[PDB]
């Protein structure tokens, strides 16, 4: 027998706390002058923080 | 991601106050002891 999503996304899995976890410092210093840019891949990378 | 300079310059310009023209305080001091006249 065939089965819809039925709201499966959404509601029969209803919903779950999520976040992010830092890991390692890609990047951090100190800078007095203009403004700052900072160019990051995205190579096997999911999420950053800031 | 050519045009490195465009950020490279940036990199530059933060250590662009290194000791040329430039003036630093110098102190003089003083030591008085069991009033004056």
Do not use: K, M
Request: net charge negative; aromatic share 10%.
């Amino acid at each position: 027998a065939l089965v819809s999503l039925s709201t499966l996304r959404g509601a029969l899995g209803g919903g779950s706390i999520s976040g992010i976890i830092p890991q390692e410092v890609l990047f951090d210093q100190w800078r007095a002058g203009g403004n700052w840019e900072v160019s990051q891949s995205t190579q096997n990378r999911t999420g950053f923080i800031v | 991601n050519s045009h490195f300079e465009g950020i490279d310059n940036a990199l530059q310009t933060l250590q662009e106050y290194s000791p040329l023209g430039r003036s630093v305080a110098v102190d003089f001091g003083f030591s008085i002891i069991g009033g004056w006249s």
